[PDB]
Amino acid sequence: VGWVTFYWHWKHLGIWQGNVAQFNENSTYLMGWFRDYLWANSAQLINGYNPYGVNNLSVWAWMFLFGHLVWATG
């Protein structure tokens, strides 16, 4: 389900911006998934709180780290 929702999300996130070419050109190899989907889209998430301030994505940043902690406690 992680594969199917990563796929759904990255394809639609291309459509929602007018850039299907990013998915169509970069999903044939795994670094495109890694870079253009995991690295590129997590940028604004982990800036939900930072040394300069806080915006409305700080719950989701805190939850993101929380989920890493619960997963690794497993």
Partner 1 sequence: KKARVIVDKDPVPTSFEKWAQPGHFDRTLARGPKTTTWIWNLHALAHDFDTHTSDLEDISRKIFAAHFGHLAVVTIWLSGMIFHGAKFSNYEAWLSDPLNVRPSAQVVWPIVGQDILNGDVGGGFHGIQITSGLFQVWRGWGITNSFQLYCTAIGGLVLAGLFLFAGWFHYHKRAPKLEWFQNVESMLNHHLQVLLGCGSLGWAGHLIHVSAPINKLMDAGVAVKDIPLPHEFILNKSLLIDLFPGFAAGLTPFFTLNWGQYADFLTFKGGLNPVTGGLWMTDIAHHHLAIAVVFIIAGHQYRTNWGIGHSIKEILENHKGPFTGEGHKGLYENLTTSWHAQLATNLAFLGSLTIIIAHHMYAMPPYPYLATDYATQLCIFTHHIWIGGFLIVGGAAHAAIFMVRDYDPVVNQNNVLDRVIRHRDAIISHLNWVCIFLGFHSFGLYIHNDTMRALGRPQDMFSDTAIQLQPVFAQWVQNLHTLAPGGTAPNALEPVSYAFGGGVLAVGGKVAMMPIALGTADFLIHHIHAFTIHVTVLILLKGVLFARSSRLIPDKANLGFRFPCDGPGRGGTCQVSGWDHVFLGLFWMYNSLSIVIFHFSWKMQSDVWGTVDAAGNVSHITGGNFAQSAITINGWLRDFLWAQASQVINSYGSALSAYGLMFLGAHFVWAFSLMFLFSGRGYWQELIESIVWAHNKLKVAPAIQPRALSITQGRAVGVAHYLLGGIATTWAFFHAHILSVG
**Contact residues for 36 (Cβ-Cβ < 8 A; gap 6+):** 10, 22, 26
Site residue total, ligand CLA (CB under 6 A): 3
* Interaction of residue 73 with ligand CLA, rule CB under 6 A: yes
Binding partner 1 by CB under 8 A: which of 25, 35, 41, 67?
35
CA distance 36 to 19: 12
What residue 43 binds from ligand CLA, partner 1, none (CB within 5 to 8 A, per partner kind)?
A: partner 1
Q: What are phi and psi of 53, to 5 degrees?
A: 170, -155
Residue among 20 and 59 whose Cβ is closer to partner 1: 59
Binding ligand CLA by CB under 6 A: which of 30, 31, 65, 72?
72
CA distance 50 to 48: 7
